[PDB]
UniProtKB/Swiss-Prot annotation:
The keyword Secreted applies. The destruction box (D-box) acts as a recognition signal for degradation via the ubiquitin-proteasome pathway. Induction: Up-regulated in peripheral blood lymphocytes in response to bacterial lipopolysaccharides (LPS). This is C-X-C motif chemokine 14.
């Protein structure tokens, strides 16, 4: 049973993401969905995006965000 998040929703940039959490849109879905919280000025303002983690495009964006988040949380040393 998959809950619809389409794929990634409106195109998110890494710069939009403040926080990335894995939790399903619906508990009746397989695995945790990927939840993306935006910074402010995003077309999706006040809503969290959800990527459906069954897709390959999710993997890079998420993985890439984990690297990018390290720069925003500031691990630059």
């Amino acid at each position: 049973s998959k809950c619809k998040c389409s794929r990634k929703g409106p195109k998110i940039r890494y710069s939009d993401v403040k926080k990335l959490e894995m939790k399903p849109k619906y508990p009746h879905c397989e695995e945790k969905m990927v939840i993306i919280t935006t910074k402010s000025v995003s077309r999706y303002r006040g809503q969290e995006h959800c990527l459906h983690p069954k897709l390959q495009s999710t993997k890079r964006f998420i993985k890439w965000y984990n690297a990018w988040n390290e720069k925003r949380r500031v691990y630059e040393e």
